[PDB]
Amino acid sequence: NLWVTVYYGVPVWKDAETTLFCASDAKAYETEKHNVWATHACVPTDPNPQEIHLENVTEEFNMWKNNMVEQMHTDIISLWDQSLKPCVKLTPLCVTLQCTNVTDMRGELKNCSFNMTTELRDKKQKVYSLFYRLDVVQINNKEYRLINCNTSAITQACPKVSFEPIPIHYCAPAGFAILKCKDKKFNGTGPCPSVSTVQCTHGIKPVVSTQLLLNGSLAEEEVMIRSENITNNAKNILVQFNTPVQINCTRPNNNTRKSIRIGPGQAFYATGDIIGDIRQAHCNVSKATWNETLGKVVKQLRKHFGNNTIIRFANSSGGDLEVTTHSFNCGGEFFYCNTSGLFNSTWISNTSVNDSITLPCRIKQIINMWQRIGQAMYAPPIQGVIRCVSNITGLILTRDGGSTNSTTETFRPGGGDMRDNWRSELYKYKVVKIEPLGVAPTRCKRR
C-alpha cells in the first residue's frame, strides 16, 4: 500500500574524522601582545555556546581511539614552527665559548666570553654572555660550545610573542557534530548514559607539561583513573584530580637583558648579570594538600589492584631530561623540576607511615621538544623575577614490569608523548558526521 518518501534532516550520524578549527573567545584578541600563542586570526567563540542533551540515547566512547587528539597534537607542533619562522635565526652563535665558574651550588652558571659578528662584516665583536650548564657543552682554559650545534640548527623566539596558554575551543564545520559525555565518573571507555552535543568544545588551555597536568579541568566527585591498557605496564596511567593542587614555580634570579646588536636589523637578547638572590630555581608544593590528594588517589588504585596491597612511590627511572623531570614554561622561561621529593613515600592499606616542601629546578633556554631535529628554539631572557601560580590537575604515571605481581606494585612518573596531555581534556569528546538523508514508507504517493 505505502510508498517511499524522502526525509531530509533525520537524526542519523556515523563516526568519522574531519578537520577541526579553533576558537579564541574573542577576548584573547584584546589581550594582544602581538599574537599570543595560537590566537592571531583565531575564530571568535559564540558568546552563547549550545549544549543539547539527547534523551534516551546511549553512545560508546573511546578516548584512546579519539582522532581529535592527533589533530591537536599536530596543531601545537605546526603552531610552534610558524612562530619560529619569521623570528631571528641564531645560526652564527656556534663560536667557541670560553667559560668560567660563577661566584655555591657547584657553579651552575657559566660566564662565557666569545667572538661575534657586528653589523659590519669587517671587524668582529668581543662580548660575554651567561648561559646555563644545560645549554653548553665543552669541547676538547675551559672552552665550551652550544649544546645544539652538533645535533641541529637553532633560532631565537621573538620577544613580542608569548607562550602563555589561552582557552581554545575546538569546533566542527558544517555537516559534522561533537558529542559530549556528561557523566560525573567516566574512564574514557564504555557506553555513556548521558550524552550531549555541542558545536564547540569547552575551554581548553594547551598547557604543555610533563609528570604534572597543569591548568586542566577538575573531575567530579571521586578522582578518576584512566589507562589504555591497565594490566599492561607498558601503557601510561592518566589521573584526573578532584581538588586543584597549588603549585609555585619561580625564577629566583633577577636578571637583565643585554639586547646586543648583531645587525643589520637583527638584535639578539643576551643574558646579563644576575642581581639578587644567589639561588637555583625552585618549586613549592604544600605538604598537606599533596598528601590529602595522595590518600584519595591511592584508594582508587585499589579498586583494581585489590583492596589490600602495598603501593610504593618513587621518582623517575631514567631517560631523556624531558622524561625524568617536570618540564613546562613559566613567564617565557622553561623550567625542569626535580620531583623526587614528592614521590618519596610508602603507603599502607589506608594510610602512610611540616608547613612546606620545595623542589630544585633547572633552566634550559635551548630546547628540542617532541624529539625534533633540525630546529632548536632559544628561550629569550626575561627582565626581573618570574613568579607563577598554577593548578595541578593530573599526572602521567607508569607501572614497573618487575613481577612479583601478586606481592606489591610501584608507580613512577611518566612522560614522552604529549598526546596524553590532550587526551586529558578530550576524553569526553569525539567527532561524528551527520547523515540527513532518509527514506520512509507512507501513503501520500503523488498526483
Partner 1 sequence: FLGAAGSTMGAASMTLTVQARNLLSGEDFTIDIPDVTVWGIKQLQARVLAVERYLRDQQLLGIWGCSGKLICCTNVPWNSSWSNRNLSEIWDNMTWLQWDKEISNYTQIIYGLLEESQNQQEKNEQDLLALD
Ligand X SMILES: *[C@@H]1O[C@H](CO)[C@@H](O[C@@H]2O[C@H](CO)[C@@H](O[C@@H]3O[C@H](CO[C@H]4O[C@H](CO)[C@@H](O)[C@H](O)[C@@H]4O)[C@@H](O)[C@H](O[C@H]4O[C@H](CO)[C@@H](O)[C@H](O)[C@@H]4O[C@H]4O[C@H](CO)[C@@H](O)[C@H](O)[C@@H]4O[C@H]4O[C@H](CO)[C@@H](O)[C@H](O)[C@@H]4O)[C@@H]3O)[C@H](O)[C@H]2NC(C)=O)[C@H](O)[C@H]1NC(C)=O
Ligand Y SMILES: *[C@@H]1O[C@H](CO)[C@@H](O[C@@H]2O[C@H](CO)[C@@H](O[C@@H]3O[C@H](CO[C@H]4O[C@H](CO[C@H]5O[C@H](CO)[C@@H](O)[C@H](O)[C@@H]5O)[C@@H](O)[C@H](O[C@H]5O[C@H](CO)[C@@H](O)[C@H](O)[C@@H]5O)[C@@H]4O)[C@@H](O)[C@H](O[C@H]4O[C@H](CO)[C@@H](O)[C@H](O)[C@@H]4O[C@H]4O[C@H](CO)[C@@H](O)[C@H](O)[C@@H]4O)[C@@H]3O)[C@H](O)[C@H]2NC(C)=O)[C@H](O)[C@H]1NC(C)=O
Ligand Z SMILES: *[C@@H]1O[C@H](CO)[C@@H](O[C@@H]2O[C@H](CO)[C@@H](O[C@@H]3O[C@H](CO)[C@@H](O)[C@H](O[C@H]4O[C@H](CO)[C@@H](O)[C@H](O)[C@@H]4O[C@H]4O[C@H](CO)[C@@H](O)[C@H](O)[C@@H]4O)[C@@H]3O)[C@H](O)[C@H]2NC(C)=O)[C@H](O)[C@H]1NC(C)=O
Ligand U SMILES: *[C@@H]1O[C@H](CO)[C@@H](O[C@@H]2O[C@H](CO)[C@@H](O)[C@H](O)[C@H]2NC(C)=O)[C@H](O)[C@H]1NC(C)=O
Ligand V SMILES: *[C@@H]1O[C@H](CO)[C@@H](O[C@@H]2O[C@H](CO)[C@@H](O[C@@H]3O[C@H](CO)[C@@H](O)[C@H](O)[C@@H]3O)[C@H](O)[C@H]2NC(C)=O)[C@H](O)[C@H]1NC(C)=O
Output the smallest distance, CB 88 to ligand V, in A: 48
Rounded to 10°, the helix 67-84/419-426 angle is: 130
* CB distance 418 to 195 below 8 Å: no
**Strand pairing partners for 196?**
53, 180
Residues 6 or more apart whose CB falls under 8 angstroms from that of 187 comprise 224, 225, 226
Q: Does 348 bind ligand V (CB under 6 A)?
A: no
User: CA 444 → CA 4, 6, 381, distances in Å?
Assistant: 9, 12, 76
Residues 360 and 338: their CA atoms lie apart, in Å, by 5
User: For residue 197, what is its C-alpha cell?
Assistant: 552535543
Output the smallest distance, CB 229 to ligand Y, in A: 4
Binding residue for ligand Y, selected from 115, 152, 229, 442, defined by CB under 6 A: 229
Q: Does 148 bind a copy of itself (CB under 8 A)?
A: yes
Site string for ligand U, 336-365 (x = CB under 6 A): --x-x-------------------------
Amino acid at 359: L
Out of ligand U, a copy of itself, ligand Y, none, which partner does residue 145 contact, by CB within 5 to 8 A per kind? a copy of itself
Output the smallest distance, CB 18 to a copy of itself, in A: 17
Q: Does 191 bind partner 1 (CB under 8 A)?
A: no
User: For residue 159, what is its C-alpha cell?
Assistant: 620577544
Q: Which is nearer to a copy of itself, 97 or 247 (CB)?
A: 97
Residues 358 and 338: their CA atoms lie apart, in Å, by 9
Binding residue for ligand V, selected from 51, 143, 292, 320, defined by CB under 6 A: 292
User: For residue 440, what is its C-alpha cell?
Assistant: 520512509
Residues between 418 and 447 that touch ligand X (CB under 6 A): none
Output the smallest distance, CB 324 to ligand U, in A: 8
DSSP states of 101-152: E---TT--EEEEEEEEE-SSSSSEEEEEEEEEGGGEEE----EEEETTTTT-
Binding residue for partner 1, selected from 15, 31, 49, 57, defined by CB under 8 A: 57
Out of ligand U, ligand X, ligand Z, none, which partner does residue 273 contact, by CB within 5 to 8 A per kind? ligand U
Q: Which is nearer to ligand X, 225 or 392 (CB)?
A: 392
Site string for ligand U, 301-320 (x = CB under 6 A): --------------------
Q: Which residues bind ligand Z (CB under 6 A)?
A: 246, 248, 284-286, 356, 389
Using CB positions, name the residue nearest to ligand Z: 284
User: CA 18 → CA 22, 71, 78, 170, distances in Å?
Assistant: 13, 9, 17, 12
User: CA 291 → CA 262, 346, 357, 379, distances in Å?
Assistant: 51, 12, 12, 34
Binding residue for partner 1, selected from 53, 124, 287, 387, defined by CB under 8 A: 53
Residues 108 and 440: their CA atoms lie apart, in Å, by 76
Residues 127 and 114: their CA atoms lie apart, in Å, by 6
Q: Does 231 bind ligand Y (CB under 6 A)?
A: yes
Binding residue for ligand Y, selected from 58, 96, 150, 232, defined by CB under 6 A: 232
Q: Does 288 bind ligand V (CB under 6 A)?
A: yes
Binding site for ligand X (CB under 6 A): 164-165, 207, 214-215, 328-331, 382-386, 388, 390
Binding site for a copy of itself (CB under 8 A): 91-92, 94-96, 115, 119-122, 145-146, 148-154, 261, 263-266, 373-374
